[PDB]
Design a binder for this molecule. Structure first.
Ligand SMILES: Nc1ncnc2c1ncn2[C@@H]1O[C@H](COP(=O)(O)OP(=O)(O)OC[C@H]2O[C@H](O)[C@H](O)[C@@H]2O)[C@@H](O)[C@H]1O
Ligand SMILES: Nc1ncnc2c1ncn2[C@@H]1O[C@H](COP(=O)(O)OP(=O)(O)OC[C@H]2O[C@H](O)[C@H](O)[C@@H]2O)[C@@H](O)[C@H]1O
Ligand SMILES: Nc1ncnc2c1ncn2[C@@H]1O[C@H](COP(=O)(O)OP(=O)(O)OC[C@H]2O[C@H](O)[C@H](O)[C@@H]2O)[C@@H](O)[C@H]1O
Ligand SMILES: Nc1ncnc2c1ncn2[C@@H]1O[C@H](COP(=O)(O)OP(=O)(O)OC[C@H]2O[C@H](O)[C@H](O)[C@@H]2O)[C@@H](O)[C@H]1O
Ligand SMILES: Nc1ncnc2c1ncn2[C@@H]1O[C@H](COP(=O)(O)OP(=O)(O)OC[C@H]2O[C@H](O)[C@H](O)[C@@H]2O)[C@@H](O)[C@H]1O
Ligand SMILES: Nc1ncnc2c1ncn2[C@@H]1O[C@H](COP(=O)(O)OP(=O)(O)OC[C@H]2O[C@H](O)[C@H](O)[C@@H]2O)[C@@H](O)[C@H]1O
Ligand SMILES: NC(=O)c1ccc(C(=O)NOCc2ccc(Sc3ccc(N)cc3)c(C(F)(F)F)c2)cc1
Ligand SMILES: NC(=O)c1ccc(C(=O)NOCc2ccc(Sc3ccc(N)cc3)c(C(F)(F)F)c2)cc1
Ligand SMILES: NC(=O)c1ccc(C(=O)NOCc2ccc(Sc3ccc(N)cc3)c(C(F)(F)F)c2)cc1
Ligand SMILES: NC(=O)c1ccc(C(=O)NOCc2ccc(Sc3ccc(N)cc3)c(C(F)(F)F)c2)cc1
Ligand SMILES: [Zn+2]
Ligand SMILES: [Zn+2]
Ligand SMILES: [Zn+2]
Ligand SMILES: [Zn+2]
Ligand SMILES: [Zn+2]
Ligand SMILES: [Zn+2]
Lengths: 279, 279, 283, 279, 283, 283
């Protein structure tokens, strides 16, 4: 399995540069009509789920003969401030689409509308009827990885075989989620990447599609990423800190998490602050 | 007037059997794609409105030369825990349709969406223009029974004669409400009956329509009902206790009643918990 | 004893004030609450009938039906019963400092489960959810009814660190009232300048007489009941209507909302009062 | 510039007449299917913004060689009780349309749905792209009056010239807002005017259009207005007092203002009380 | 007496700090609140102008307009007036324990109706909604203005159980300040390490001098006013701007929301403080 | 001193109770909370790992990784860290009067920033956000970490009206525990009838021994930890699992919601308890 470059050194922007880049991110969100976010495992590290390629990442530790460490189970994990900031950005109509490589189920469990989300690598809580393609979002992890039989049968009125949604190394991306992600990415005038190294094709390349027809690209990550050279703005810090400052400049609160909830469909936007005068 | 079998003895499932049947009801709600509820006077007894055929029912007492007793007026009556649990089940998209034989106005006053409700026997708070068929939901009971003239005139811009909506013994069921009820009942994969003896045609037979094409039928009642033999599950207890345990297993709170409110149209579902793994 | 016990006057005819008289009496009750510095409420089984608990001496009361060879009807268990609008209005009146004390003959546990502060409540006849250590007198408020009546052994033992025998708090016919609850009820009743009675026939001694103590030194007495009561002649105002309708109108005149019930909750101690509307000019 | 009749004496209905007229207004709102409100500068005087023609109005003071006095800036001004009562009336589906002559931005900043609002004289917070006609609702006043260049450029993906939306004396009314106002006014069965002298054509005449095909007209103002003779009901008092009593009779609370918020689109109505029996 | 009464300097020119100076002064006010252990606020009629109550000595003040033969303008009645953003910011500052005491010259009743705790408020000039028993000194907070000015008989009688004559609390020109309110204001002012004045010209003795007591033993004084005030020279910081804009920016720097107003409410007694943000490092 | 300092047993193997045993132990913990009159919690670095703060002696602990020549990893700064479900469950347990005292070895500041009342909290090892006047002992809770460790001068001066030198509160290896916090922890621990330890290995003297004081005069001890702890043999119940999973199940059995975190807030003093569910019958 090609696991790419693992355990690169972290970069930390010093405070004054950090504060000034988040103001510039604010400016781009205000100026943009179609904003798409791309998330990876870096946005879940602050709730106790290790990443893949970070200092204590899954791959990084296995390369050194060590184990990844979980400070939580998938079921007891709480969405981060970043997760909840993405919920609110979608509710006030500032986020058009969310593209995620994470199988951790937290975006769905955060209350984020599934019809605005592409889970490119599947969802550990989601099993899907082989025949009728009906998905079930379960309250516990389904039990298998690699699109195998879970043991359970479809209940739609069918008795179809339910399989997990976790892609194995050689498994192709779900076409609907990839097509929705690719469509949102081409149409975006701003793509913001959060805690991904962007080292996986084609997930990691979707943000680049935004640069075609003059879109802007922002990369928020602690480590270098595959596409650092193509970004108009790279922010080297904790995504929780970036997103709490961004939300403060936008005049938005980060909503409370009520515990695990499934929203199928986005609502019309809630009221949002009026926009600053720019330049 | 055929008043059927009145004052049958109550049945109480003992606690362990009761707890186990409500878990089975939970399982059927989770497994079902289209759930229809049928309510009668048993769901209003806990707010001080007597039923018809129960031990102290209207008919039961008149058969013995006694009076029904009200512990409230129709106007001061509050929706029960069961009423409010039905509001929440509809808001989170677990209830497709509600079919009620009650004229007590509480489902509407509970905030329940009128476009998901069939009031088969009319509403004591609702008067309707003879000519333009415009309904008014009033804050007090309209004053007459049997589709007579209330005294008031239509205000749409008409001066049509306003009549009560309470069917007398020989009066046919409103076709729109009966057609919507019959349609929801045939399409349901689960019908749950709450505090009805099911002794009235065709209201009491609508739940049976669900058994055609393999639907399941659940009867919640203290007394035997006309159709006990056709049920996959009969729960003999207080509907308030059944529904508060059901809501607990589903991970749903019973919302506060803000006082009397009219919602014409259902909204898209609110977020709900993810589903348990079954079998 | 229990069989022969005097159950008083049962099944007396109900009275309904007509709407204009009813509307005018609730306005007068509002006026007396506004004018009063110490308001004490006395409740009985009439305030619980609208949540499916039958009363004792009403048309379908427990004693009334027994007299006719019939059974009373429950539309709920004690555990699944919800406090009425009246219960929740009393919670709010205490929170905004307009109720000084609450004196109740009810064993139905709903005042405590409503969230009403126990240090402002006298449960004269006990509480079906409450057991008490014979040894150290520590009370436990349970989530289910305790099991026994008549100050008997429940089966459970005290857990204070004692292992005392736990007993129910339900008075049998010949059992004396708890001294502390009677002394606090009697103290609040003498000091009240307004006593309001809700859904009691006031037929039991001394529970039913406590409201009269308010009339000494010029206190005013208000009786809210569908039936006549033992002390109708001593009342400055008698309201014949459903307590839920009286209390929801009263709360509307006072500018107070009836708070939501979160499900069963035990509050031991009252807080300082919440803000309340300013008072009308009365003259 | 024709500034009409300025500084007319105020009229105050005495309390018993005042209370009785607001009950009659309540009755007309209950009886009406399409209610349109017309607002002018009188509904903003209670938040410290002077009117034009009132005792201390802009024009009235300039006629006497004095200045208008502001007790607030446009940015720090809070919507009045009347503003917030109009928000709630629209949310519960009792207000069809709102027509405003005010440039003070408070209706938008109150959270009122822009697709139900006609700002006939423009909005001091709103600038608009000369070319693509895209509007921006800014957090501060834009800086110019009379449809001039603000200095800023369009950001839609264009670089169009942004202009203020404030009509000068000779500038024609925006056709879309005037057409929506005129359409709502003809279709209304009740028009209620709040704190306008109705002295400006065609804004001040729109309410009269309601009287065609038998609509009712209510004028709430402290001074005489151009069209007093055409009203079925004239209420001489503070609009805050009229609207707080009206809201009390309707059983509606006046919602909290969360600070400045932009809602583009109206939602389906929230639940509302059932209606009184009338006559 | 009333006709000849010295109404001081009326209609002095307004001052507007330009935006960058204004932004920097509010940051400095934030810093002084953070650094201070005892913060006392002094309010006058300037904090009520944004809800439609004209002031006394502003460009359109009551006295200013009288001097020019003109009338002041009300955009509201006293009863329909809503507390400003400033009123509600003072409520929150008291709730989170950052305001020790509030001293007000206003008779407009809005501080009380805002829900501000009366035991932390000195109403130096009285309250138009408040009448007081001549006999027993019991105050009543009414929902409408009481009717009279100058400590006269209102017409109503006391209801404590007294039948005392009820009088308004509005001081006439020659009437002495209530001793209790002056002594509590004077005590809080001497003990304050920060006094902030909002919308008063500080021209009235001794109300306008209380803030100076803070300067003794090294207290800091902040004056927020659109016009010059009697004591501008003694201030460590003078902010020339709209009080609503100053207080909404100050609350933003402090990390505090301005709470919703529920409509008119009377709170007699302050609660323990609510949680508040932790303090910035200052050096 | 610091280099040679005994860092105890680091990187001991993790234990996971299987789900049925885990479910049954949390039910037993629920039972002990219900049965107990004085419940004291002892927390350490294990309750902060789920918000991205590594512990000391866990598999990736600070000391564990140092032993292997590796670095610990932070997924957050101290300032951007959010309190865990466990932190917020402890807030609620204190609010409903089911937690008497909280004793913590953590310097991460999250208990204070969670809104937990400081007068019920002993921070045995100090708080990175808290500096203290050398002269007058006045503490300041800052919005950012103070800058220094080992009771050194921060650079700032006291603002009480004093100009005392402000020092950090972080104990160095040889620094004695603050007397007041140790005496209040020791007092609560002796008087507890239940001590529950969450995410501490209990290896530090005397912090790690305080829970044992509860076992004297028949107190019960519960240890919640993924690894063995120094005092496993003295525990009446050891739960080997994630503290977030244990505490969310415990709160579910108790009928309590885990309240929302508003962002960083300092509460100095506890309030009277909020209402809580009535207790199950246990026998
Ligand atoms: N709090 C944080 N803030 C900012 N950046 C962070 C944080 N925590 C970690 N990082 C950075 O977060 C980045 C995480 O990058 P990777 O670990 O490759 O995760 P992926 O989502 O991109 O991997 C995609 C797929 O690859 C796998 O095979 C699976 O199939 C995954 O689905 C690093 O650069 C960290 O520095
Ligand atoms: N709390 C309770 N929980 C459970 N069951 C209950 C409860 N209370 C009563 N019951 C049961 O509730 C059942 C109520 O049955 P019926 O009284 O016939 O009412 P309907 O709605 O079916 O009557 C339909 C029409 O008939 C009339 O002519 C009118 O036109 C009505 O509209 C009994 O079996 C009770 O045991
Ligand atoms: N919804 C209602 N609204 C108003 N009044 C009502 C309502 N329902 C009933 N009432 C009236 O409520 C009144 C209730 O009177 P009683 O039934 O004697 O109850 P107690 O609490 O005074 O019985 C005292 C003790 O006696 C026993 O032996 C036990 O020991 C009790 O503790 C009636 O007059 C009804 O008209
Ligand atoms: N609180 C109040 N309650 C009731 N009436 C009020 C109140 N305050 C003021 N009034 C009355 O409010 C009325 C305000 O009338 P005008 O001042 O002409 O404002 P417009 O909106 O109609 O002027 C329209 C345009 O004319 C300009 O050129 C601009 O272009 C404006 O856009 C008076 O009769 C006051 O008595
Ligand atoms: N919105 C505003 N923002 C800021 N400052 C303001 C505002 N509006 C007005 N001001 C300023 O607010 C200041 C208000 O000063 P004065 O009008 O003398 O009121 P007092 O409360 O001190 O009068 C004291 C007593 O005197 C009387 O005789 C009664 O007895 C009073 O109780 C002005 O300088 C305005 O610039
Ligand atoms: N999410 C989790 N859930 C449950 N247990 C956990 C979790 N994460 C870690 N643990 C356990 O949490 C335990 C934490 O034990 P230690 O790391 O020694 O921390 P202390 O607070 O007791 O260190 C005391 C002092 O020593 C220092 O020198 C400083 O001065 C400290 O103040 C481990 O056994 C983990 O298994
Ligand atoms: N709102 C309220 O407070 C409220 C209202 C009603 C009730 C109520 O009905 N509870 O049961 C008490 C009861 C029932 C029957 C008998 S008769 C009897 C006698 C002997 C036996 N073995 C069985 C029944 C006896 C009593 F007192 F007579 F025993 C007592 C409780 C509380
Ligand atoms: N909601 C409202 O009622 C409301 C009230 C006022 C306003 C508002 O400010 N609009 O401009 C009107 C205006 C202002 C000043 C002058 S005089 C002037 C202007 C600028 C300078 N530099 C000097 C004098 C003149 C006018 F017409 F007299 F010129 C006209 C907007 C809304
Ligand atoms: N925010 C505030 O606190 C506030 C602001 C303004 C006001 C205010 O305007 N209230 O009326 C007081 C008043 C008005 C006119 C006169 S002149 C007069 C004299 C004699 C008669 N008969 C009538 C009017 C006299 C006063 F003091 F001079 F009498 C007193 C009240 C409160
Ligand atoms: N949840 C919690 O409470 C929590 C968990 C973890 C931590 C934590 O990691 N904080 O830093 C303390 C620390 C780090 C390294 C060293 S080693 C060292 C020695 C000398 C220098 N100059 C630098 C590093 C030393 C210490 F103690 F050894 F110094 C102390 C803090 C709090
Ligand atoms: Zn299938
Ligand atoms: Zn009609
Ligand atoms: Zn005991
Ligand atoms: Zn453009
Ligand atoms: Zn008196
Ligand atoms: Zn000091």
């Amino acid at each position: 399995a090609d696991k790419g470059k693992c355990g690169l050194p972290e970069i930390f922007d010093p405070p004054e540069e950090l504060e000034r880049k988040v103001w510039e991110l604010a400016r781009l969100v205000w100026q943009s009509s179609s904003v798409v976010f791309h998330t990876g495992a870096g946005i879940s590290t602050a709730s106790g789920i290790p990443d893949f390629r970070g200092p204590h990442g899954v791959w990084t530790m296995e390369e050194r003969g060590l184990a990844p460490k979980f400070d939580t189970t998938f079921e007891s994990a709480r969405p981060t401030q970043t997760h909840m900031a993405l919920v609110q950005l979608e509710r006030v109509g500032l986020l058009r689409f969310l593209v995620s490589q994470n199988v951790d189920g937290l975006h769905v469990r955060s209350g984020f509308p599934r019809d605005k989300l592409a889970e490119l690598h599947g969802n550990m809580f989601v099993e899907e009827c082989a025949k009728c393609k009906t998905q079930y979002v379960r309250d516990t992890v389904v039990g298998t990885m690699g699109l195998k039989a879970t043991g359970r049968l479809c209940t739609v009125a069918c008795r179809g075989e339910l399989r997990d949604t976790i892609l194995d190394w050689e498994d192709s991306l779900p076409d609907r989620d990839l097509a929705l992600a690719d469509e949102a990415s081409r149409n975006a005038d701003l793509s913001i990447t959060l805690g991904t190294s962007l080292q996986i094709r084609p997930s990691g390349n979707l943000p680049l599609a935004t640069k075609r027809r003059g879109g802007r690209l922002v990369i928020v990550n602690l480590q270098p990423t595959k596409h650092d050279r193509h970004a108009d703005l790279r922010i080297h810090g904790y995504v929780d800190e970036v997103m709490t400052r961004l939300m403060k400049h936008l005049g938005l609160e980060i909503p409370a998490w009520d515990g695990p909830r499934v929203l199928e469909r986005a609502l019309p936007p809630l009221p949002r602050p009026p926009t600053p005068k720019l330049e």
